[PDB]
């Protein structure tokens, strides 16, 4: 909806361990 | 193949500023009437709005690539845009040129074939991803033509 927003994605590696991928909010 | 997709997205977002300014500058140098009085990039307010729209479109296209589906782009960015541009007097043919230049840039970064900047990847092939991101950019023109 708002394109200026950031983005956060959660990847499961194992139970209770995650890889976090970020796109920052726009300047 | 998910690691390749993450690399491909990173290659775009890491160069997103240069992509937008170079595409909108390219649209202008090909059609300098856009900068003359009465042109739709004339005045700083207009040039800033155009640069903003370049960035928005690229932002949506990068989501679509990160998701492997066009819906976010079509629903949140492309829906309504043609009508808006008509109502505003934003030239859709010049818009499509800006988008086509960003398409050429993204294909280059994804396949690591940019002339002015190399990035770091394990050897392999990303042609599917480059063809996919192209199809997202082509949806923009399709929506606003
Ligand atoms: C006006 C005189 C005018 C331009 C401005 C320019 C616009 C233009 N740019 C391309 C192709 C690319 N631009 C790229 C952008 C970048 N490369 C970098 O290393 C930095 C980070 C960033 C911004 C400067 C890239 C990667 C490309 C792809 C080709 C390449 O790597 O050299 C085109 C070609 C568009 C097409 O193929 O349709 C155009 C028109 N050109 C001008 O005439
Ligand atoms: C086209 C995009 C490229 C290309 C990409 C390849 N990447 C490959 C492996 C790889 N890439 C990453 C980084 C990615 N994963 C992440 O979790 C994050 C951020 C959170 C990113 C940016 C990883 C971790 C890996 C796995 C290998 C490694 O651990 O070093 C790869 C090899 C195949 C594969 O793993 O699928 C390719 C081909 N390669 C190219 O030559 C073009 C230009
Ligand atoms: C640049 C490559 C173009 C160009 C673009 C202009 N856009 C102008 C205004 C504008 N754009 C949008 C759509 C944009 N807003 C969004 O929220 C989203 C997606 C969610 C998008 C794509 C809107 C709603 C507006 C109006 C509000 C505003 O001004 O931001 C604009 C200003 C027009 C005017 O008022 O004079 C321009 C110049 N112009 C060009 O010549 C090239 C082709």
Numbering used by the authors:
A (entry chain A): 268 to 294
B (entry chain B): 33 to 177
Article passage:
Red algae utilise a megadalton-size light harvesting antenna called the red algal phycobilisome (PBS)—comprised of rod structures formed from stacked, hexameric protein-pigment rings emanating from a protein core that is poised above an integral membrane photosystem. Published cryo-EM maps for two red algal phycobilisomes contain clusters of unmodelled density homologous to the cryptophyte-αβ protomer. These domains bind to, and stabilise, a conserved hydrophobic surface on phycoerythrin β, which is the same binding site for its primary partner in the red algal phycobilisome, phycoerythrin α.
16 of these apparently ‘lone’ PE β subunits (with no PE α partners) are conserved between the two red algal PBS structures (which equates to 8 pairs of PE β subunits in each as both red algal PBS has two-fold symmetry). Of these conserved ‘lone’ PE β subunits, three pairs are bound to other red algal PBS proteins. The 6 non-CALM bound ‘lone’ PE β subunits also appear to have found ways to cope with this patch, either through truncation or by co-opting alternative binding partners. This includes a new linker protein, Linker 3, which we have modelled. LR2, “Linker 3”, LR3 and LR6 retain C-terminal domains with some similarity to Pfam01383.
